[PDB]
Amino acid sequence: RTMNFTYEVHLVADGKFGTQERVNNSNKKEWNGMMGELLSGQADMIVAPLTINNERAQYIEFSKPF
Amino acid sequence: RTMNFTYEVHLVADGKFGTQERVNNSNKKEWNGMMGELLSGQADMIVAPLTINNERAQYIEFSKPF
Amino acid sequence: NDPRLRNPSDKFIYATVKQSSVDIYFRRQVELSTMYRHMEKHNYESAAEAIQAVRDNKLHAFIWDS
Amino acid sequence: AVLEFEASQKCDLVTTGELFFRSGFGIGMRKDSPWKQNVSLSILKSHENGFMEDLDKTWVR
Amino acid sequence: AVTVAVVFGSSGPLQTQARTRLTSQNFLDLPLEIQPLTVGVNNTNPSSILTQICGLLGAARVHGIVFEDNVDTEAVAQLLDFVSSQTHVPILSISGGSAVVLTPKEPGSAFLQLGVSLEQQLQVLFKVLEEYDWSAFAVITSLHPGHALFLEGVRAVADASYLSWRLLDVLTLELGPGGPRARTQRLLRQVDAPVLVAYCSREEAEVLFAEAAQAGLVGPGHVWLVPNLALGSTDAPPAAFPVGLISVVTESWRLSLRQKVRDGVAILALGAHSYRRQYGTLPAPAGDCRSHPGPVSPAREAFYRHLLNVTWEGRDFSFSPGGYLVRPTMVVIALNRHRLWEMVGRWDHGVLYMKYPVWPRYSTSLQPVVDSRHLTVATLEERPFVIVESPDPGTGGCVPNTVPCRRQSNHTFSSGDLTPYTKLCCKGFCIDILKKLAKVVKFSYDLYLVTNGKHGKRVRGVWNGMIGEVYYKRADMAIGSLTINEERSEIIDFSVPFVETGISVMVSRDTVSGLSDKKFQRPQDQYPPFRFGTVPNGSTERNIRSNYRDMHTHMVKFNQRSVEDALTSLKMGKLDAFIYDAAVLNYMAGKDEGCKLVTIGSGKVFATTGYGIAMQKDSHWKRAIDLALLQLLGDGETQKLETVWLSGICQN
Ligand SMILES: *[C@@H]1O[C@H](CO)[C@@H](O[C@@H]2O[C@H](CO)[C@@H](O[C@H]3O[C@H](CO)[C@@H](O)[C@H](O)[C@@H]3O)[C@H](O)[C@H]2NC(C)=O)[C@H](O)[C@H]1NC(C)=O
Ligand SMILES: *[C@@H]1O[C@H](CO)[C@@H](O[C@@H]2O[C@H](CO)[C@@H](O)[C@H](O)[C@H]2NC(C)=O)[C@H](O)[C@H]1NC(C)=O
Ligand SMILES: *[C@@H]1O[C@H](CO)[C@@H](O[C@@H]2O[C@H](CO)[C@@H](O)[C@H](O)[C@H]2NC(C)=O)[C@H](O)[C@H]1NC(C)=O
Ligand SMILES: *[C@@H]1O[C@H](CO)[C@@H](O[C@@H]2O[C@H](CO)[C@@H](O)[C@H](O)[C@H]2NC(C)=O)[C@H](O)[C@H]1NC(C)=O
Ligand SMILES: *[C@@H]1O[C@H](CO)[C@@H](O[C@@H]2O[C@H](CO)[C@@H](O)[C@H](O)[C@H]2NC(C)=O)[C@H](O)[C@H]1NC(C)=O
Ligand SMILES: *[C@@H]1O[C@H](CO)[C@@H](O)[C@H](O)[C@H]1NC(C)=O
Ligand SMILES: *[C@@H]1O[C@H](CO)[C@@H](O)[C@H](O)[C@H]1NC(C)=O
Ligand SMILES: *[C@@H]1O[C@H](CO)[C@@H](O)[C@H](O)[C@H]1NC(C)=O
Ligand SMILES: *[C@@H]1O[C@H](CO)[C@@H](O)[C@H](O)[C@H]1NC(C)=O
Ligand SMILES: N[C@@H](CCC(=O)O)C(=O)O
């Protein structure tokens, strides 16, 4: 309402907050859960109790803590 | 008695265990107290509750703790 | 800092949620390696399941957001 | 050791907290002393059999 | 019934090779009636290859072709791929220059080279660098085509690895025959890296190694690693190649030509057999050169798909869609003192198993100089201080904070080259102390456990255990639960005691309240005998024997074998006093459900000593290690280690 944008909410597929795990045979690392959805482009915003930490902040942008 | 040597015992002149201090207008620091007495040659062996630490061990040989 | 957590045993069972910030926190720390292994052996899929396990005495401690 | 002996003998005083810098007392000699090994061996033997315990009982109970 | 054509491109004993084979009675293990057909090209030039393969293919309705040539050939793989595209005949290139991987292969072509990609070789070589803790390497490449792919591969592998790789510099040299030498000699004199990774052909490799010898980059302080391309015929390494050159080849490097031909025919036969078993008919024979079958004709594509995944004699010949060997068994070879390509390591699955836990270095010809900063450390498991684990086979290595260690064994349980030495991972209080000492005093080290004795005991004038290893110069120093006493201190040098300990008595609940009590001195006097014993062959048993003869004679009966067994007997009631080391008894008391109590407060440690790092007598590391330990004690790091390792559940 404050910023006048419309929205549509969906739940994350695997129900995980998100960490970095290497692909199968020690290949490139990728993100799971909500972080992966945001990074890949399936979501434009993460509205959840997402903890701010260094590893996630290197890839996404956090707001001020609410 | 065990090591077969005679001895003469004297007290430390200034009653200090020993530390490194830099008096003003000095070219280097020097140990005082028992450490200075042993390093200068006034004494041959320190038989006292002398703590073993890294600072003293650089200039002085310590036995196994008694 | 409790010794029980620092000394894992089969009787005491503590864990957290998979792919979360607590996993990152315990993984990045080196002094928490044993706790990390013990937690990883018994990690739960979601917070609600871990809460239920704590109520049902299947899990002794649950480490999660304040 | 000194503080514990003082507290025990003199009373009216108490030691507080846990030991925060653990070390030992050692006989100090000049660097590369020829008989440093002999002094160390004698001290180890004294620890081993009974001599340090006897000294502890006699002087600082 | 399936027909396989074998083409020999080798220009040596070609007639001998042709005469060795072409017998259909061979290959009975395969579940088909193999029909071999030999060709044996003469000069392996484009015209001969094309003409012979076209005459062969358009006559005998062949199913597949197996090709082999010498390592000198360069553009033969392109011709074979072109022929496969034109005629849609599956080909199997084995050995020679035709087995060097061509990454882009003519989308509609079944070439299937029996070699490994460049990125896989880079992966294995970087795992080798990881194993010996080699970072700060440098990359030397020539103008050889494909060096850009090599640089892309090294950058991708270095970036996609947990270890912080630090590439010093990359430099490109002409390395042409009889050309500018001062230009490359100028740059080769500026390289400071201790590890050098090179990429060039055989001739450029020889030129590069000659110039490096002129620039003094061949000595014992330089390691060179090259892929298969740099070397040629491994049977006769050239004189310019330095000793200790490392490369990674496939497992068929030691196979004869007949064995490789048999393997290729087996792959084709197994593919055809699977295709027939699923489709109920043998695959159709290949076409001819006088036509171009524009469509893929999915009958052909299905046969190619079946040819991809094949297992044979317990070896995985699974082929990548890029037509090269994927997940193959690779071996790591090196050039030894005798100038022979000796096998060093293996790449079974994704795990490295290599001999030589410390990389041996030779001063040019001979004199295997030893590194002055590399210490050999002996130890053994004690539980609060040294803990051994098996590394996870899934990840290959083991978790951080855990130093890799090995067993004390030679090549007699290896039974060949399956596992020459047991690769374990050690952690604990003493291992943390050792890691801090290594990072401060700045030395390298390996770690090996002890299997002859446990701690040290002069048996008929001969010492076993850690004291035996250090005394007999087998190990530079020993760490662990090693107590300082006079008998050991006479023989070897000891560091300052970094953790206090001594004789302590453990009871299960004041009972005796002293080692000099009446019950210990004269157990046999009266009443049900006081049942107290210890694990023999240690400082405690030595102290008891040297001081109290009657007590030792009585404890001879209750000679326990393990600390855990002694605690079990104490809880069950088979003994009521256990005499052992104070540092470990305090730990055992702390983490107890029943909360066993030491006989007096703080155990009242008797015969107070400490754990020391045993070193060889009159060694030069003694003072540095003593100062490092005193610094660690002063800074409070030992207190943190005690908190993280020796904390007890009910000590408080
Ligand atoms: C530390 O203790 C050592 C053992 O007691 C001691 O070694 C002993 O030294 C004496 C010399 O004073 C040796 O005696 C031999 O040599 C003398 C003089 O050459 C001869 O007259 C004797 O007959 C004998 O041959 C002992 O043999 C020797 N003991 C051992 C076991 O080697 C060290 O001298 C002591 N360190 C000191 C005092 O600084
Ligand atoms: C969301 O609301 C804002 C204001 O709250 C809108 O911004 C202006 O809205 C007025 C409506 O009277 C328009 O006349 C202006 O042209 C708008 N300005 C801009 C810059 O857009 C905004 O349009 C609203 N978002 C919509 C309608 O999608
Ligand atoms: C203890 O020391 C004394 C003197 O320092 C020793 O007495 C003499 O030592 C000299 C040194 O070689 C010998 O030549 C003499 O023979 C000794 N005197 C006698 C009467 O034997 C004494 O021997 C030492 N005790 C030992 C070594 O046990
Ligand atoms: C090797 O790969 C081929 C191709 O995927 C496999 O053939 C398939 O087998 C399944 C099993 O029933 C069939 O459903 C498919 O139709 C087959 N596809 C083709 C193209 O033939 C073959 O099974 C694999 N072999 C092994 C041992 O795994
Ligand atoms: C303590 O040392 C004794 C003697 O060295 C060990 O007894 C040996 O045990 C092995 C079993 O592995 C036998 O093969 C030897 O013959 C025994 N030696 C003798 C002289 O009998 C005893 O095992 C050791 N105890 C330990 C290490 O706990
Ligand atoms: C690859 O990952 C999947 C999903 O975790 C797993 O099921 C499979 O076993 C893995 N395969 C290999 C070869 O690691
Ligand atoms: C420097 O040392 C001399 C030595 O006696 C003293 O007299 C003087 O006051 C000192 N100067 C200072 C402390 O500024
Ligand atoms: C061609 O092959 C024949 C026998 O097959 C051999 O005698 C001849 O030397 C070969 N040609 C060359 C140039 O070697
Ligand atoms: C190899 O180890 C065995 C113990 O398993 C030992 O008996 C043998 O003497 C050793 N051989 C050596 C060190 O050459
Ligand atoms: N570390 C001990 C072994 C166990 C003990 O005696 O407490 C030793 O020096 O032999």
Q: Does ligand 5 come within 6 angstroms of the Cβ of E127?
A: no
- What is the CA(A25)–ligand 6 centre distance, in A? 8
Q: How far apart are CA C15 and CA C8, in angstroms?
A: 11
Q: Following DSSP, what letter does each residue of E134-203 receive, concatenated?
A: --SEEEEEES-TTHHHHHHHHHHHHHSSSS------EEEE---TTS--HHHHHHHTS---SEEEEE--HH
Contact between E497 and B64 using a beta-carbon 8 Å cutoff: yes
Residue for token digits 């070439």? Answer: E111
Q: Is the dihedral of CA E629, E634, E639, E641 positive or negative?
A: negative
**Which residue in chain C has the smallest CA separation from E650?**
C3
Residue for token digits 């310590």? Answer: B62
Using a CB–CB cut-off of 8 Å, the residues of E that contact A are 160, 350, 395
Name the packing angle between helices E582-590 and E563-572 (round to 10°).
Answer: 50
Contact between E630 and B52 using a beta-carbon 8 Å cutoff: yes
Contact between C19 and A53 using a beta-carbon 8 Å cutoff: no
Contact between E626 and B58 using a beta-carbon 8 Å cutoff: no
Contact between E651 and C3 using a beta-carbon 8 Å cutoff: yes
Q: Does ligand 8 come within 6 angstroms of the Cβ of E43?
A: yes
**Which residue in chain B has the smallest CA separation from E629?**
B54
Rounded (10°) CA dihedral A8, A14, A15, A18: -100
> For residues E355 and E453, is the Cβ–Cβ distance under 8 A?
no
What residues form DSSP beta bridges with C61? C14
Nearest partner of C25 among C33, C7, A58, judged by Cα: C33
SS3 E342: strand
Q: How far apart are CA E118 and CA E101, in angstroms?
A: 8
Contacts for E328-331 with beta carbons within 8 Å, 24 or more apart?
Answer: E328/E116, E328/E120, E328/E250, E328/E251, E329/E250, E329/E251, E330/E116, E330/E120, E330/E121, E330/E124, E330/E248, E330/E249, E330/E250, E330/E251, E331/E248, E331/E249, E331/E250, E331/E251, E331/E253
> For residues E174 and E142, is the Cβ–Cβ distance under 8 A?
yes
Nearest partner of E39 among E65, E3, E61, judged by Cα: E65
Name the packing angle between helices C33-41 and C21-28 (round to 10°).
Answer: 140
Q: How far apart are CA E137 and CA E191, in angstroms?
A: 10
> For residues E148 and E103, is the Cβ–Cβ distance under 8 A?
no
> For residues E200 and E175, is the Cβ–Cβ distance under 8 A?
yes
Chain B interface, best mutation among E487, E496, E609, E611, by max B CB count within 10 A: E496
SS3 E404: strand
Number of H helices, E strands in chain C: 4, 2
* Main-chain phi, psi angles of D17, to 5 degrees: 80, 170
Q: How far apart are CA E138 and CA E199, in angstroms?
A: 11
Chain C interface, best mutation among E401, E637, E642, by max C CB count within 10 A: E401
Chains E and D touch (3+ CB pairs under 8 A): yes
In this structure, which amino acid lies at residue E559? Answer: N
Nearest partner of E248 among E313, E199, E321, E206, judged by Cα: E199
Cα angle E66-E331-E228, degrees, rounded to a multiple of 5: 65
Choose which residue among B22, B23, B24 to substitute to test ligand 7 binding: the one with the highest number of ligand atoms within 8 A of its C-beta: B24
Question: Which chains have at least 3 CB atom pairs separated by less than 8 Å from chain C?
Answer: A, E
Class of residue E377 by CB neighbours under 10 A (exposed 0-12, middle 13-18, buried 19+): buried
Name which residue sits closest to atom 16 of ligand 4, judged by CA.
Answer: E278
Class of residue A61 by CB neighbours under 10 A (exposed 0-12, middle 13-18, buried 19+): exposed
Tell whether D19 lies on the interface with E, counting CB pairs under 8 A.
Answer: no
Q: Does ligand 7 come within 6 angstroms of the Cβ of B27?
A: no
Q: How far apart are CA A19 and CA A25, in angstroms?
A: 17
Q: How far apart are CA A56 and CA E152, in angstroms?
A: 28
Determination technique used: cryo-EM
Q: How far apart are CA E291 and CA E86, in angstroms?
A: 8
* Main-chain phi, psi angles of E512, to 5 degrees: -115, -40
Residue for token digits 């902040």? Answer: A57
Residues with CB under 6 A from ligand 9: E 409-410, 412
Q: Does ligand 10 come within 6 angstroms of the Cβ of E581?
A: yes
Q: Following DSSP, what letter does each residue of E27-51 receive, concatenated?
A: --SSSS--EEEE---SS--HHHHHH
Q: How far apart are CA E29 and CA E223, in angstroms?
A: 44
Name which residue sits closest to atom 12 of ligand 9, judged by CA.
Answer: E410
Q: How far apart are CA D18 and CA E320, in angstroms?
A: 65
Contacts of E278 (CB under 8 A, 6+ apart): E306
Reading the block at residue E591, the tokens are 């983490």
Strands E170-173 and E614-615: unpaired
Q: How far apart are CA E309 and CA E306, in angstroms?
A: 6
Resolution in Å, one decimal place: 3.0
What ligand has the least distance to the C-alpha of A3? 2
In this structure, which amino acid lies at residue A2? Answer: T
Q: How far apart are CA E322 and CA E53, in angstroms?
A: 23
In this structure, which amino acid lies at residue E522? Answer: R
Reading the block at residue E457, the tokens are 């005991």
CA atoms within a 13 Å half-sphere pointing along the CA-CB vector of A43: 18
Contact between B3 and D47 using a beta-carbon 8 Å cutoff: no
SS3 D32: coil
> For residues C25 and A53, is the Cβ–Cβ distance under 8 A?
yes
Cα angle B4-B5-B9, degrees, rounded to a multiple of 5: 140
Residues from chain E contacting residue A27 (CB–CB below 8 Å): 160
Distance from CA of C55 to the nearest CA of E (A): 24
Nearest partner of E628 among E375, E321, E329, E339, judged by Cα: E375
Contacts of E122 (CB under 8 A, 6+ apart): E150, E153, E154, E157, E227
Q: How far apart are CA E27 and CA B48, in angstroms?
A: 89
Chain B interface, best mutation among D39, D41, D42, D59, by max B CB count within 10 A: D39
- Closest CB to E648: pick one of C3, C30, C37: C3
Residues from chain D contacting residue E634 (CB–CB below 8 Å): 21
Name the packing angle between helices E637-645 and E429-441 (round to 10°).
Answer: 150
**Which residue in chain E has the smallest CA separation from B57?**
E627
